[PDB]
Paper text:
After motion correction, CTF estimation, 2D classification, 3D classification and 3D refinement, we obtained L-P complexes in three integrity states: the full-length L-P complex (Lf-P), core L-P complex (Lc-P) and core L-extended P complex (Lc-Pe). The final resolution of Lf-P complex, the Lc-P complex and Lc-Pe were 3.41 Å, 3.0 Å and 3.25 Å respectively. In comparison, the structure of the Lc-P complex contains the RdRp domain and PRNTase domain of the L protein and P tetramer. When we analyzed the Lc-P structure, we found that the solved regions of each P monomer are P1 (261–301), P2 (250–305), P3 (259–312), and P4 (274–399), whereby the P4 monomer contains the largest number of residues built into the cryo-EM density map. Our structural analysis showed that the P-OD regions of the four monomers form a four-helix bundle. Due to the flexibility of P-XD, this region was only modeled in P4, where it interacts with L. Analysis of the complex structures showed that P1&P2 (P-OD regions, 261–289) interact with L, while P3 (260–312) and P4 (274–283, 308–315) are bound to the helix of P1&P2. (2) On the palm subdomain of the L protein, a three-helix bundle from P4 (351–399) interacts with the L protein near the putative NTP entrance channel. The R356, D357, R366 and K393 of P4 form electrostatic interactions with E301, D309 and H336 of L protein. In addition, L362 of P4 forms hydrophobic interactions with L299 and F306 of L protein. We did not identify any close interactions between L and P3, because the P3 monomer interacts almost exclusively with the other P monomers.
Author numbering:
A (entry chain E): 274 to 289, 294 to 342, 350 to 399
B (entry chain D): 262 to 312
C (entry chain C): 264 to 305
D (entry chain B): 268 to 301
E (entry chain A): 8 to 544, 553 to 583, 588 to 611, 629 to 887, 894 to 1194, 1209 to 1265, 1278 to 1302, 1310 to 1384
Amino acid sequence: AVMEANLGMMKILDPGSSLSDLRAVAKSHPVLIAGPGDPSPYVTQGGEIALNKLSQPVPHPSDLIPDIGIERDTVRALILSRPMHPSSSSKLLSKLDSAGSVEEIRKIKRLALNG
Amino acid sequence: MRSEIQQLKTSVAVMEANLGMMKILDPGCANVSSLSDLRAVAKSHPVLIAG
Amino acid sequence: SEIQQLKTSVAVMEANLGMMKILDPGCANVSSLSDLRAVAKS
Amino acid sequence: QLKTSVAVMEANLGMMKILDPGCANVSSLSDLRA
Amino acid sequence: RAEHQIILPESHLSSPLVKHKLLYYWKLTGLPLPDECDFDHLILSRQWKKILESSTPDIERMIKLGRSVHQTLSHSSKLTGILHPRCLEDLVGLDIPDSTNKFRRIEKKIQIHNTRYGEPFTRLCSYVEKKLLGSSWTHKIRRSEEFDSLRTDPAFWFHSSWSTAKFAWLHVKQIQRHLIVAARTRSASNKLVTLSHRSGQVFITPELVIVTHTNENKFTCLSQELVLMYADMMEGRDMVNIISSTAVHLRCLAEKIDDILRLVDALARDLGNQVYDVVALMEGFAYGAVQLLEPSGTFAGDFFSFNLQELRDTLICLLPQRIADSVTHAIANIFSGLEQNQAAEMLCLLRLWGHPLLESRAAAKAVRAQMCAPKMVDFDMILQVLSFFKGTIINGYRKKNAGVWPRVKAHTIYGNVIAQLHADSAEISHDIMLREYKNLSAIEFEACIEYDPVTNLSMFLKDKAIAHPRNNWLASFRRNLLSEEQKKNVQDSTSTNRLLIEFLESNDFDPYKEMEYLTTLEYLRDDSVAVSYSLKEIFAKLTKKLRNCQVMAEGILADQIAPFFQGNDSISLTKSMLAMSQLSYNSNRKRIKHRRRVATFITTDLQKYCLNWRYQTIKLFAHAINQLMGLPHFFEWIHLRLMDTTMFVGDPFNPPSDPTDYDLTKVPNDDIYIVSARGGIEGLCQKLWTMISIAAIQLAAARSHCRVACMVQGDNQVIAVTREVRPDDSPESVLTQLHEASDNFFRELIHVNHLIGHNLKDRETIRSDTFFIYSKRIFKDGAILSQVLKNSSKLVLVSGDLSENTVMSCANISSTVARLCENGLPKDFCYYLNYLMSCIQTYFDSEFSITSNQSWINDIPFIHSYVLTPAQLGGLSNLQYSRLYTRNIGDPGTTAFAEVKRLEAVGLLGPNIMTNILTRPPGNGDWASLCNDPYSFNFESVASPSIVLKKHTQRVLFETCSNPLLSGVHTEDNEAEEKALAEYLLNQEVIHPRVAHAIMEASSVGRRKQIQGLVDTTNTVIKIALSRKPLGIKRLARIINYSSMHAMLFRDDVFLSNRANHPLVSSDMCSLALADYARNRSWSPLTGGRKILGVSNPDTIELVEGEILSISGGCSKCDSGDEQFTWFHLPSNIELTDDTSKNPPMRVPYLGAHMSPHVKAALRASSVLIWAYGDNDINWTAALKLARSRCNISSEYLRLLSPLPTAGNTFTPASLYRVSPYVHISNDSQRLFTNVVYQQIMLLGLSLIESLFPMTVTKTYDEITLHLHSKFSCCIREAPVAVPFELTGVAPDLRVVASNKFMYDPNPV
């Protein structure tokens, strides 16, 4: 009716990773200045405010933007530390140094945790 | 009936005038507040606005 | 009735505008023993 | 009446975020009291 | 002089490590600084050409020390100045042969101790175990191989890895403490000790210790509390090595710990001070190795992989990529392969590299980055949390006040749902709080809570520092370091700036006028308010008025509003937490709609919790509590004051680096400053934040449609999300429902904390089906998970600073060894370990002393019988063998004589010592000393130095007390009233010390003692009160020579005596006959021959004669005519590992109004006085005159309000709970103790059950049944005839002031 004549939306972009999905999923809110200070370093040309993981306005939104060693060490920790029959533990450790990708380590992780 | 509708229209007319004075943020940052608002407000006894 | 629901929907508007007003540190002399509709209407 | 009330609800109550523009810069206390 | 030998230097680290104290003393000598300190902000700015011309002794020692150190190094190369922690690995291997040969003199005597007394210790332990377990278990009484390794290697403390550096750093520490004591005296002695180590030297002064390596041409400098940090970490990691390599279930850890230590030492040479960003992750690797052992495939290895990724990410920024990979692989192989307890034991690796060097500028940057940040919080989520906040307030007030809502404004009750609950005063459900949140958040209250500003009174008596105001803030720093116009802005401070002393001296103190500092907004006009921040890694420093209002606000919230949210305290926290992990999956799996409830756990820690609260988030919650109290403006003060003020991180060696800073309102948001802070400070306003966190947790519970049992103490929050299942429901379905509930709740908790401005992580929070983490203990499947190595790291060798006290040092050793025995160790190992460590203690105090004993320190049977005789009788032993099984509730005298009788029987303690204790000459003795300390003997003894200094400062600080609150506390005749009351109570026909202790504690005399004992007598307070009034000559000579007088008094009384007047009782009678003989003989000059009675209780080990039944059953006692026993049963085939599908049901084992408290104490004194002496008119007149001192009741209201005459006159768990949650107790065939004694028997029985299963055992195999038979004991006595009489004499006057709310109740009840 006569409601959008005063409340200016400000297009907040909470990340609830590129700049496209941030602009795509970004609800517009009428933000209300309560504390003292200057909010001008945190808005952007176009009226958009990017929030942190602590709901903190950030100066530029680009602040908001695998491995095999860790994934093999953790599955060694799962084979070594869980209760398991000692032949089967040595068999799962045998076909783990022969791995060569992140895939087929995840097969052992779902092969060890499922027995 | 109609009198309560008149009070609803008057109360919404008060609400739109109160939202016209709040510091809603726009691109440009016209209505900001300093730290001297608290300093000028704290110089007196805390007041009762109730009614 | 719908008017009786509009009354209790219009009343929490002022009770929320008084809440938004007392969040400002410049509204620090607003005593807590005061109606938030009365804070909103002032 | 039923439409302008929900127009105040959607932009007043559900969508309302509260900004505290904290002094994340290098400026003295007497410079913030200006 | 002798006044300087009272408050000794601290022997252990109690303070942070300031970098610029060390760099002040480094620059003050002419040595080159480290190369990361060339462009330092404080070193390049101070005027050293005036500092070095002060010609104080503190600078002359440094200049002479630099001429000493520089002379030994060479000019052919570059002198390097390596700073901590880049010198961990070199000081790790420090090897002074002058301290090795000085500890080998102690080792040579401990080996003679073993070869003379180790076989009677075996005989003792086998004796007590054969008595408590019967002679049908006698083919299973062997000493543990922990005990046997302690028995073959007596010098466990001397022959481990890390022992040579432990020797060297303890000798360097004791030399530097001696030099500080010598430098207190104005003298001209050579205060420079040079030791020579393997390839280098060590230079010791009261301020620096310099270690020089001469082949590498390097040196390092260490400050006063940095050699304490090195000494503490050396004996800590050495004792961790000793305990982990002796204990059988820990021997795989020992090598691992050496690896995990030495590797990180090698990182400290090239990570530097950021190596403690690696050390901080070590805790995480102990929490992820427990989560490897999950019942499902979910949650397993999530936090482990997260910490391994964090360790890689911290290493790749500083190291090469290959070394980061190899170190990450090494950390991954250390923490892998562990058990459930062995993974929790690796929480000892926290304080084991020590602490970083702190500075104010980096701490202030870390605070400004998060406390001056902008925030954007959602208003609707504040309304939802406020709805649950106000609904929890309404339900809590309704529960407390018998079904009545708070006084709600009638025009603020919106809708038809809350207006219907208001008329019925019905309890609001969480679903109505979520549905009707727009109507429940908008509700207002009225003044319907009568608060009380001063309630606790112990929080106003704490030794908290007060910041001197902001026109004098440059007195925060050392005046030597300020600039020339910064020295002109420093004034003299007449105050002491302590909360205690400036609370006592502040007359015209009205609490309701001190709260007007906040309600009237006068804290915000006031231009003298300064806040100072402290160096840490929880503490600030406020001004006087603002600290008073903060203490009041915390007390008011914790007294009135905080129990509405339930807070969700030692036994009741191992019953609310040990029963909370009974809800886990593996606790009830043999059991597996709405029949049986299970839970899965979420331990969350919020990122930067206290300094992300804004005024915009907390304002409506503070508004609700202000309306509920009737206060215009009280509970939102911290954000409004810190927005308007500037604060600084205060440290005496860290001044402002700009020499032209004089006024705080003009300094930039820079160096040490936080200008207009918007967050909160930790500890301040904690109760409000905990309540808002509970409201958010219950909101996340209702938004995800589940029930939740939480527990939150700030940023550490523990949630059990619960789910009700069928017994015939499949275990896969139970695990699936728990995982879905934990996922839904955890998403909603993320969501409602992000919108009120907080961050708990998606990966750092530990979610688990099995365990949770509370007070840094892991609670896992109804059991507490072991931390023996943490307690081993604190098994240290000097305790306290108030004198050279050996008794208190051996007492700390005994308490730590008892805490080791509680975390599951063999009993014989802990008992002989305490003997050997107490011998190490008592030989470490004749040598290595920083301040006569030549006759008795070379006497091995004296040192044996002096460390093994109990402390109640004059020896050093604060560990009876009964304390290994249970708690010390009972009579200390009968336990003392029972241990002496056992030690005499097995051959440890000689026959002379028993008869010399029995024929011991009596002490001075008063009726007041018998009343204030019952269970006590009138033996000649020296008073403990801590008791004397504590009592002196309590008597000195209350001489200048002037405030109207607590005005009648310090009277001029309180000692005369105490002597008169004790002579009235005790000097009767029948002498009862315990009921007289109860009466005097319930009167105004014990109330004065209780109020004066609330003051915080720290070392600074004791220094202040000794400066304001000196101690004397006799008392101070007793403080200084306390240990020699204690030892020579043992030598004269009970070790070396003739005693031709042989006593009546012999050494073979029961120990309570012995203790009654010793009391009746010792108090005989005071008493005159009457029987001090009503005191002694039987020792629990001496009382019972246990028996474990055979396979067929039947006991050799009950075959001999015995019927009185307690029955203990343990079911067969109990798993103690994750395979809990066939375990018996687990339960919590056995562990142990509406008036003013003045009327409660008065009625308690009335009940005790009529119960103990008689019930007639003179006894009731005396009961009236004693109860009249605390309240204002009349004679007829005593007789209809006094209770019936009765016998009423996790931080540290009692034990691990592995097989004690399965034991069944029947105290049915024993009818004599159906009382304290059957509690002792039940606890002894549970400790004997769990003693049967060492930590290497995960499965039971048979059934165990105990009969604790106690019928044919020598220590069984029938209760005597209570003979009433009239109290001869008249009761003392017991005058009282009427204005005190803390000592008197003027209302006629």
